[PDB]
Paper text:
In 2010, four groups identified a novel FA-associated nuclease, FAN1, that directly binds to monoubiquitinated FANCD2, participating in ICL repair. The FAN1 nuclease is recruited to the damage foci through its UBZ domain and acts as an effector by executing one or more DNA strand incisions during ICL repair. Previous studies have indicated that the depletion of FAN1 or mutations that defect the nuclease activity cause hypersensitivity to ICL-inducing agents and defects in HR, suggesting its significance for efficient ICL repair.
Here, we report the crystal structure of human FAN1 lacking the highly flexible UBZ domain (referred to hereafter as hFAN1 for brevity). The asymmetric unit contains one molecule encompassing residues 371–1010 with four disordered loops (residues 506–516, 557–569, 755–765 and 792–809). The overall structure of hFAN1 consists of an SAP-containing N-terminal domain (NTD, residues 371–594), a middle tetratricopeptide repeat domain (TPR domain, residues 595–772) and a C-terminal viral replication and repair nuclease domain (VRR_nuc domain, residues 773–1010) and folds into the shape of a short handled scoop. In the active site of PaFAN1, residues D507, E522 and K524 of the typical PDXn(D/E)XK motif, together with a nearby residue, E386, coordinate the dimetal group, and these four residues are strictly conserved in hFAN1 (D960, E975, K977 and E834). In addition, the nearly identical orientation of these residues suggests that they may share a common DNA cleavage mechanism. In addition, the notably disordered loop between α11 and α12 is close to the equivalent position of the “wedge” that protrudes into the substrate junction in the PaFAN1 structure, suggesting that this loop in hFAN1 may be involved in DNA-induced conformational changes.
Residue numbers in the entry: 371 to 505, 517 to 556, 570 to 754, 766 to 791, 810 to 1016
């Protein structure tokens, strides 16, 4: 079996069905769907999951026959049709769905039958031309010809699809979103921890329904922007917003504010707030700097959702009010109350202060960052199209010459791996409610919140101190104990391939020493998602002197962000040698293209 589809899908079902709290989020007819799936032949299931994992559409039978899923497809198709899982071309009625089935040559023919301008144009141009032209009923003739070219086609029924899609959603809350069917899930070993729920995330079936819907909406818009369709991301935002202004006053949402942050992010209101945030990003690309502000004030006006997205909101409110423009009178109105917001991280506090400095009151405060050592290195920029490496790979070579034979470009991951190795027991400890809810988590659900540290404070305080005052020998021992206990395998916070060997991990740890590791581990436990991002590109070290350097690499016209300046300062404060390594694009005279 060179797909993993059914295998992973079956593991997903097992994981979700285990929790009887979750299964009450489906009615009997819906759980009936799940029973029916199990009753299907192995082959019917292999086909269903394959269709289920890909983006939804009709599939030609010829395409299913060609990719050789069974010897005779007819009985499989019938089993699936009888069970309510699949529908056939008799139900295929929407012109746009039919056109989508067609190949480039097929569309080209249709175009000649119907005398379109450019029968040799792009598939999507031709499709749009057909749709536009489709208004004895001409659109009907087009539909009939097009259906005829398409041939027998199938499509998974939207009803059972939604059951499985919600099951898939329950399986991994937010931690291209169903790629889980693509990896070998069944082969993965998860950490040993105890499931322990106390608090429901979803009130009832409806709550999960609404959350699933909001989730799909956000994902459509997120992808639209990434492809560059800025016009076509604006209208669903407004569709969302219309719905949001009704939803925010819904009774089902009153319980969501009694959830700790680490569960609250798995609720509708959180999803809409993320929509509204994406919405603001849209207007900024569309030069509509007026309406963005109106939405930023509304986001900032509330403290229920996305508190970690406050600094970015104030920072954009200011930048918009500044160079977008009127009036320069209420920008500092926003900068001052921004600087008063305790949810705003140091990086955004700087960008706000850095703008208040631009001047003609202005009472407080005092923002200043320690400078770190800068270095310039030389390299040969390759043509955008026309031996042989990337910017960091280059820098590594410079440090190799400079004396640091060992080096790793892992960014934050190298440290979050050490962290996972040194704090495994605490990260996975029992007695914290709501934090492990199923058997397939790689971390506790509160890793990235203030709640992680507070719920484990005594163990962390003892452990962080144990590390700080530890001799090198102990550190090597701890890394080994975890490594061996988790067989270099269990799926977690630890990137088992980040290091060449347990031996290399042990060397790094003997160079960093207790104090530095403890400081970084303390940071990772206090604010994981933000510490990790701010950790520099490389760690390099000399194997004999045990000296090491943390190094950020900046290519030509690459700039140290505010966030990075702060974290380099924090690392330096812990006693680590820290350096910015600039690369200057230089000429060569000995190898062209
Ligand atoms: Pt994309």
């Amino acid at each position: 079996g060179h797909p993993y589809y059914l295998r992973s899908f079956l593991v997903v079902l097992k994981t979700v069905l285990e929790n009887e709290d979750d299964m009450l989020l489906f009615d009997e007819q819906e759980k009936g769907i799940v029973t029916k799936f199990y009753q299907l032949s192995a082959t019917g299931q292999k086909l269903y999951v394959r269709l289920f994992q890909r983006k939804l559409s009709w599939i030609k039978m010829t395409k299913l026959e060609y990719e050789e899923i069974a010897l005779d497809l007819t009985p499989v198709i019938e089993e699936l049709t009888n069970a309510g899982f699949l529908q056939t071309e008799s139900e295929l009625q929407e012109l746009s769905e039919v056109l989508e089935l067609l190949s480039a040559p097929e569309l080209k023919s249709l175009a000649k039958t119907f005398h379109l301008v450019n029968p040799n144009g792009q598939k999507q141009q031709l499709v749009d031309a057909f749709l536009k032209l489709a208004k004895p009923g001409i659109g009907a003739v087009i539909l009939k010809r097009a259906k005829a070219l398409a041939g027998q086609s199938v499509r998974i029924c939207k009803g059972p699809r939604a059951v499985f899609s919600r099951i898939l959603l329950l399986f991994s809350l937010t931690d291209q979103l169903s790629t889980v069917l693509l990896v070998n899930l069944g082969r993965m070993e998860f950490p040993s921890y105890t499931i322990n729920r106390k608090t429901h995330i979803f009130q009832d079936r409806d709550d999960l329904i609404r959350y699933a819907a909001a989730t799909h909406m956000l994902s459509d818009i997120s992808s639209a922007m990434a492809n560059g369709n800025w016009e076509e991301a604006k209208e669903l935002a407004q569709c969302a917003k219309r719905d949001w202004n009704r939803l925010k006053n819904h009774p089902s949402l009153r319980c969501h504010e009694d959830l700790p942050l680490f569960l609250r992010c798995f609720t509708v209101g959180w999803i809409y707030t993320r929509i509204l945030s994406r919405f603001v990003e849209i207007l900024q690309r569309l030069h509509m700097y007026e309406e963005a502000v109106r939405e930023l004030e509304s986001l900032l006006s509330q403290r229920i959702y996305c508190p970690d997205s406050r600094g970015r909101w104030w920072d954009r409110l200011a930048l918009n009010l500044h160079q977008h423009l009127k009036r320069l009178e209420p920008t500092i109105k926003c900068i001052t109350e921004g600087l008063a917001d305790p949810e705003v991280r140091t990086g955004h506090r700087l960008s706000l202060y850095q703008r208040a400095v631009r001047l003609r009151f202005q009472q407080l405060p005092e923002m200043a960052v320690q400078d770190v050592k800068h270095v310039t290195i030389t390299g040969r920029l390759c043509p955008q199209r026309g031996v042989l490496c990337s910017v960091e790979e280059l820098a590594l070579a410079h440090y190799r010459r400079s004396g640091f034979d060992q080096g790793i470009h892992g960014e934050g991951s190298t440290f979050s791996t050490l962290y996972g190795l040194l704090l495994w027991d605490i990260i996975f400890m029992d007695g914290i409610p709501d934090v492990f809810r199923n058997a397939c988590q790689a971390f506790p659900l509160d890793l990235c919140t203030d709640s992680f540290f507070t719920s484990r404070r005594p163990a962390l305080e003892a452990r962080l101190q144990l590390i700080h005052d530890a001799p090198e020998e102990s550190l090597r021992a701890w890394v080994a104990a975890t490594w061996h206990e988790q067989e270099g395998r269990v799926a977690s916070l630890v990137s088992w391939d980040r290091f060449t060997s347990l031996q290399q991990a042990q060397d790094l740890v003997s160079c960093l020493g207790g104090p530095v590791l403890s400081g970084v581990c303390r940071h990772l436990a206090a604010d994981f998602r933000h510490c990790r991002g701010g950790l520099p590109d490389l760690v390099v070290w000399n194997s004999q002197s045990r000296h090491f350097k943390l190094v950020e690499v900046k290519g030509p016209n690459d700039r140290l962000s505010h966030k990075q300046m702060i974290w380099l300062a924090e690392l330096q404060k812990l006693g680590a040698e820290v350096e910015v390594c600039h690369v200057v694009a230089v000429g060569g005279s000995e190898n062209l293209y």
